Design a protein around this ligand. Structure first.
Ligand SMILES: *[C@](O)(C(=O)NC)[C@H](CC[C@H](C)F)NC(=O)[C@@H]1[C@H]2CCC[C@H]2CN1C(=O)[C@@H](NC(=O)OC)C(C)(C)C
Ligand SMILES: *[C@](O)(C(=O)NC)[C@H](CC[C@H](C)F)NC(=O)[C@@H]1[C@H]2CCC[C@H]2CN1C(=O)[C@@H](NC(=O)OC)C(C)(C)C
Lengths: 305, 305
């Protein structure tokens, strides 16, 4: 038993991390087969940043201007191109540690692990969610740009995030591995504010199921609710609507515990309207929304990779 | 900015994880050079467990009875011995992925990462603290025995924990890599209860410094306290005494923020006596005690490995 915020094992991603330097700027890149992916702003100084013309800056670079280091070893760059907000540096050596991988654009509410890196060297790993407002609540210092987020399914690493920016209040924005930002954000140092965030209702329910599985049952009430009536309450408390798809996705946890989803919704409604009254659930004094149903099953069933 | 519970990158440990089977029992082992370390209870059935005589059970085993698998590959066992609560299986192949390593017995209050594993395959990684009562609040399912806890210092993996048991209320007990339990516990299925736990005061202070560094300052008051007067309050709230060593260890964070440790102690005293009043600190509605001062510096300074 027990329940922790649990990241994927990071080894398969660690073997892909490199350092990319262009001029004065150094950040991280991702080396897969014979391509290194990194944020396009490696080609900028911190005066280009107010509004860089990246296409223009890149035309004045050539392959040799990119210093790519995998540990101690320089990798010779033999081609380069820009795809949205990422650069692809073709190198003359394929990474022998490349795992089976895919690039995937994740949906808001889904979780992933971040391997935070500096100068191509991993610092730590932690689990995040893509927030409904397309930011992530990460932990990043200057030098972490190009760090990636990912999920692992058996042997296959699905890369979903590359770090680019920090927005006001210490939240983070970035791209998929095709270089397309999540959310309305752009890679320039200009006033941009995230939309107002919302709580990921299906994930809160998943975490209440995790609590039940772990024997922390105190909040289960004797009632039920309709989907529509629950959503009227979710709206008031800035929770996202619960859909029938969400109900179906919660099916495995509902079956395991014998608690119908709409019964769990009645218990969550009471928690929203009345509070926790100083009690905890799974050691938390707030309702947690960064565990997906799959995260709960994986952690409560021992899924390995 | 940002602050997350952050585990060490797990790759160097993943490359050491194997499966060990003896008879009906399968669990995880740690393969370093030509030795596999695992819990001695691999030689038990789940009837031996009330009170096994491990020395006696082991005399009736020979090398070939231990099936050790590293991924797809069986490793031939050529020697075995017992050291306290761990078995050491000598194998005929040295692990080529062995990192620089040490075995270290950590002190209560210190943190480490756990790589949870099943059938020799890693499932996830998370950060824990050794509690003052010598348990850890982990996340472990049957099959996770032999999973290890560790810290990384640049290139060197310091292994500090191997998982053996779960105690009432879903907390966990285990050994160092010399097989000596943390705490009074024994590897048998007999009534054992942890001592009453306490809150790790120096770590709470470290986390308040992390909050200040991240701009979450609301709880800083205008006062100071003496060490003695603070400890009288810590005692009442089941917090461990703060020592001068702790004050000195907090020096780097105090210097960074300009807040003297005893001034931060006055702010913590007020939080203990008055509560948070529904506010959060670093996104938490409770005071967090599983970040050490070093954890805060590492995460707020970008230390890599
Ligand atoms: C990376 O570029 C990096 O690590 N480089 C070595 C950094 C990481 C900063 C934090 C830790 F996330 N990101 C930037 O500095 C980006 C930069 C590229 C896109 C536009 C440029 C500014 N920038 C920012 O994050 C700014 N954010 C901002 O303008 O938001 C509207 C701030 C944080 C520098 C003000
Ligand atoms: C490991 O042995 C394992 O994973 N084996 C495949 C397990 C892990 C159990 C949980 C997830 F931690 N541990 C045990 O079952 C141990 C076992 C070895 C030492 C004594 C034996 C009982 N045991 C327990 O953890 C029991 N704890 C207990 O007796 O505490 C006083 C319980 C949890 C099985 C009752």
């Amino acid at each position: 038993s027990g329940f922790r915020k649990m990241a994927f094992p990071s080894g398969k991603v660690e073997g892909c991390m490199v350092q990319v330097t262009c001029g004065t700027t150094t950040l991280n890149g991702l080396w897969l087969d014979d391509v290194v992916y990194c944020p396009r702003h490696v080609i900028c100084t911190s005066e280009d940043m107010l509004n860089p013309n990246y296409e223009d800056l890149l035309i004045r670079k050539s392959n040799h201007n990119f210093l790519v280091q995998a540990g101690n070893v320089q990798l010779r760059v033999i081609g380069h191109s820009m795809q949205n907000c990422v650069l692809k540096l073709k190198v003359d050596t394929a990474n022998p540690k490349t795992p089976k991988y895919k690039f995937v654009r994740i949906q808001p509410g889904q979780t992933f692990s971040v391997l935070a890196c500096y100068n191509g060297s991993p610092s730590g790993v932690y689990q995040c969610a893509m927030r409904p407002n397309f930011t992530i609540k990460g932990s990043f210092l200057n030098g972490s740009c190009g760090s990636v987020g990912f999920n692992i399914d058996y042997d296959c690493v699905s890369f979903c995030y590359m770090h680019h920016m920090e927005l006001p209040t210490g939240v983070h924005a970035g791209t998929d591995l095709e270089g397309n930002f999540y959310g309305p954000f752009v890679d320039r140092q200009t006033a941009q504010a995230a939309g107002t965030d919302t709580t990921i209702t299906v994930n809160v329910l998943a975490w209440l199921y995790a609590a039940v599985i772990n024997g922390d049952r105190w909040f289960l009430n004797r009632f039920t609710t309709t989907l529509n009536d629950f959503n009227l309450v979710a709206m008031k408390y800035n929770y996202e609507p619960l859909t029938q798809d969400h109900v179906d996705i919660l099916g495995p946890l509902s079956a395991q515990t014998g608690i119908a989803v709409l019964d769990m919704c009645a218990s969550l409604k009471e928690l929203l309207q009345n509070g926790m009254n100083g009690r905890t659930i799974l050691g938390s004094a707030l309702l947690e929304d960064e565990f997906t149903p799959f995260d709960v099953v994986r952690q409560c069933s021992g899924v390995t990779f």
